[PDB]
Design a protein around this ligand. Structure first.
Ligand SMILES: CCC(C)(C)[C@H](N)C(=O)O
Ligand SMILES: [Cl-]
Ligand code: NA
Ligand code: NA
Length: 245
C-alpha cells in the first residue's frame, strides 16, 4: 500500500540523513580542534619578545619547548617552525630536544608555500611525511609578530586519526578524498582500492548534497546520499529492503 511504503521511505530517509550528519560532524570537529590548537600555538609563539625569535639559537631554546609541550598535549606526530633560510625547528615523536634541520627542503612544500599565500590556517590533503613516514594531515600558519614574518608553523596529525573516528560512527558511512578515492569507512571492506564507487558518485553528482537517491548493486536496490565536507565527499548507503520488504 503506497501509504505504508511512503512511511517507511520517509523514516529511513530521516534516519540515514541523521547518520550522514554525524559523519559530517566528525570530520568538522576533527578539523576545528586541530585549527584551534594551531591558532593557540601561533599566539604563544608570537607572544615571545622579538629577542627570543631573531636568532636561531634563541628559536631553539625558546620556541622548541613550546613546540614540544603542544605536541605532547595533543599527541601530534610533528610540530615545527620553518624559517625563510630554509631551516626548520622540528619537534618529532620518537625524548631529545627539538633540533634545527637544514635538510628537509621546506620551501618546496605546499604547507610552507601555501601558508604564505593566505592569512588563514592552511590544511593539506593527506600525504606521506618525510620524517616519520606516516600519512598526515598538516595544518600550517604563517606567524607574524607586529606585521613581521617569523616563520611558518606546521602541525602534522596522522590521517589515521580521522579515519578511525569516521569508522567508529554509526551507519554505513564513508569518505572520499578530493580525488574521489576512498579515504575512510565504517565497513573496512569499502577501502579495497578495486571497488568501483561510480554508481554512488554518479548518483551524488546528479542529486546534490544530502539528497537521497536510489541505485542498483547486483540487481538489488539500495538507497543513499552524499554531501561535501571541505574537500571530502561523505556518503551513506543501505539496502532498500526496508522500503520494499
Ligand atoms: C618539516 C616538514 C615535515 C615535518 C617533514 C613535513 N611532514 C613534510 O613532509 O614536509
Ligand atoms: Cl582536517
Ligand atoms: Na608538498
Ligand atoms: Na558510520
Amino acid at each position: 500500500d503506497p501509504f505504508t511504503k511512503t512511511s517507511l521511505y520517509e523514516s529511513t530517509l530521516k534516519n540515514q540523513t541523521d547518520l550522514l550528519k554525524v559523519t559530517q560532524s566528525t570530520v568538522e570537529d576533527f578539523r576545528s580542534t586541530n585549527q584551534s590548537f594551531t591558532r593557540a600555538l601561533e599566539k604563544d609563539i608570537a607572544n615571545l619578545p622579538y629577542q627570543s625569535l631573531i636568532t636561531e639559537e634563541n628559536i631553539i631554546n625558546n620556541v622548541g619547548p613550546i613546540l614540544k609541550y603542544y605536541r605532547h598535549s595533543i599527541n601530534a606526530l610533528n610540530v615545527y617552525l620553518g624559517l625563510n633560510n630554509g631551516k626548520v625547528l622540528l619537534s618529532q615523536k620518537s625524548a631529545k630536544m627539538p633540533e634545527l634541520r637544514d635538510d628537509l627542503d621546506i620551501k618546496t612544500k605546499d604547507w610552507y608555500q601555501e601558508a604564505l599565500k593566505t592569512n588563514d590556517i592552511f590544511v593539506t590533503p593527506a600525504y606521506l611525511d618525510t620524517v616519520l613516514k606516516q600519512y598526515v594531515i598538516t595544518y600550517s600558519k604563517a606567524i607574524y609578530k607586529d606585521g613581521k614574518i617569523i616563520g611558518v608553523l606546521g602541525v602534522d596529525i596522522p590521517s589515521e586519526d580521522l579515519q578511525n573516528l569516521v569508522a567508529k560512527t554509526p551507519g554505513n558511512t564513508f569518505l572520499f578524498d578530493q580525488k574521489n578515492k576512498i579515504f575512510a569507512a565504517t565497513n573496512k571492506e569499502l577501502l579495497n582500492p578495486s571497488i568501483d564507487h561510480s554508481p554512488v558518485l554518479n548518483a551524488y553528482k546528479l542529486n546534490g548534497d544530502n539528497n537521497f537517491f536510489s541505485y542498483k548493486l547486483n540487481n538489488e536496490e539500495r538507497l543513499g546520499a552524499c554531501t561535501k565536507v571541505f574537500a571530502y565527499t561523505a556518503c551513506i548507503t543501505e539496502s532498500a529492503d526496508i522500503i520494499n520488504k
